[PDB]
Amino acid sequence: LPAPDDTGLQAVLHTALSQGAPGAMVRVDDNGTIHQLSEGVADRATGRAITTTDRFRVGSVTKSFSAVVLLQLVDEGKLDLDASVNTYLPGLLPDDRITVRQVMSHRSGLYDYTNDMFAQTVPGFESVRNKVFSYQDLITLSLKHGVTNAPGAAYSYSNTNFVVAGMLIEKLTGHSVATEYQNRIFTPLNLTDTFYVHPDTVIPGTHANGYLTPDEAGGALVDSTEQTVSWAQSAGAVISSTQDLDTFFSALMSGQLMSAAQLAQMQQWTTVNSTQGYGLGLRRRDLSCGISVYGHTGTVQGYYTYAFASKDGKRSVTALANTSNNVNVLNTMARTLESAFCGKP
Numbered sequence: 001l002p003a004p005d006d007t008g009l010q011a012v013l014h015t016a017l018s019q020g021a022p023g024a025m026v027r028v029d030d031n032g033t034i035h036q037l038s039e040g041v042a043d044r045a046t047g048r049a050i051t052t053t054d055r056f057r058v059g060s061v062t063k064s065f066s067a068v069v070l071l072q073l074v075d076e077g078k079l080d081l082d083a084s085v086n087t088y089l090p091g092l093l094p095d096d097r098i099t100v101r102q103v104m105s106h107r108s109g110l111y112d113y114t115n116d117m118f119a120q121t122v123p124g125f126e127s128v129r130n131k132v133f134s135y136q137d138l139i140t141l142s143l144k145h146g147v148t149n150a151p152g153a154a155y156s157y158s159n160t161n162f163v164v165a166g167m168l169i170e171k172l173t174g175h176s177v178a179t180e181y182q183n184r185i186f187t188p189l190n191l192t193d194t195f196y197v198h199p200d201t202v203i204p205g206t207h208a209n210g211y212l213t214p215d216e217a218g219g220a221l222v223d224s225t226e227q228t229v230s231w232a233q234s235a236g237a238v239i240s241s242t243q244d245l246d247t248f249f250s251a252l253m254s255g256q257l258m259s260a261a262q263l264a265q266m267q268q269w270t271t272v273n274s275t276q277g278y279g280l281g282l283r284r285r286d287l288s289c290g291i292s293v294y295g296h297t298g299t300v301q302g303y304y305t306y307a308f309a310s311k312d313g314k315r316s317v318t319a320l321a322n323t324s325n326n327v328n329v330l331n332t333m334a335r336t337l338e339s340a341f342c343g344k345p
């Protein structure tokens with residue numbers, strides 16, 4: 001790989017701040033050599049500086065954790081990716097043709113309930129932030145709407161799919177998702193900054209606060225740090241750090257978290273757009289220099305995450321900006337992958 005470009009990383013972070021991120025940071029593990037940069041504030045009211053050791057909400061990066069647990073259950077003979085969801089969770093979905101593999105790759109047609117929840121960003125946050133939902137409650141919210149496409153037929157990202165994932169985990173193991181994440185992932189990889197505390201609202205330890213951008217241009221930021229994340233659960237509620245996400249995706253890509261056969265299933269790409277794919281709870285991004293990287297994004301209120309590794313896991317990158325609902329910032333932060341993997345132009 002090209003050398004990571006720290007000057008380019010610096011510029012990306014600075015641009016993100018100029019676009020409304022209170023703070024922005026990035027860590028690169030380059031085959032044992034660390035790159036770490038941060039700019040701005042973890043807490044915009046106190047002025048406390050952001051740092052790459054600050055814990056944060058990884059949002060939909062959680063889907064990759066959920067997928068790892070499911071794929072280990074496949075390895076153990078407890079789950080068949082091509083069995084129908086309703087084989088395991090009778091009567092859950094309106095169509096007994098929707099399979100586990102389709103849910104995990106967003107090909108199920110299940111309506112994304114979050115489009116109802118967050119039609120208005122800040123009011124929707126205020127509505128859900130202190131609520132506790134069951135898995136079933138979230139599925140019922142989706143099922144108020146028709147499916148959007150035939151099973152398997154179309155890619156359509158939906159939180160509902162990874163709510164199903166958490167249900168499946170809990171039903172088949174008899175354990176909570178927190179227990180499964182801890183025993184299968186957090187403990188074996190020694191992820192000392194990684195937690196699943198749902199429905200607790202506290203972020204353990206030193207953390208970046210999250211700042212939700214309102215839908216109204218120029219509006220005041222809303223502190224969205226403390227919330228249950230019950231609206232997402234196994235689709236979105238993991239807490240981590242840049243070091244731990246780097247460790248996790250390196251371990252994944254280098255073959256440490258499941259059999260080779262299941263990793264290959266995880267990397268069967270469904271087209272997302274001309275430069276992206278989706279596997280089983282896993283994203284592929286194609287970079288300008290002809291490198292692809294593998295991992296996931298997150299956008300939970302107040303936190304934009306990128307966490308991606310090279311194919312062999314030897315270079316991993318995690319970037320965080322502590323705002324959300326700010327596509328300028330989202331788009332800018334994607335450029336950390338360019339600078340970290342493609343290097344200087």
Ligand SMILES: *P(=O)([O-])Oc1ccccc1C(=O)[O-]
Nearest residue numbers: 059060061236297298299300
């Ligand atoms: P998670 O809920 O963090 O996620 C989302 C939600 C909406 C759009 C995109 C994504 C993502 O980046 O995976």
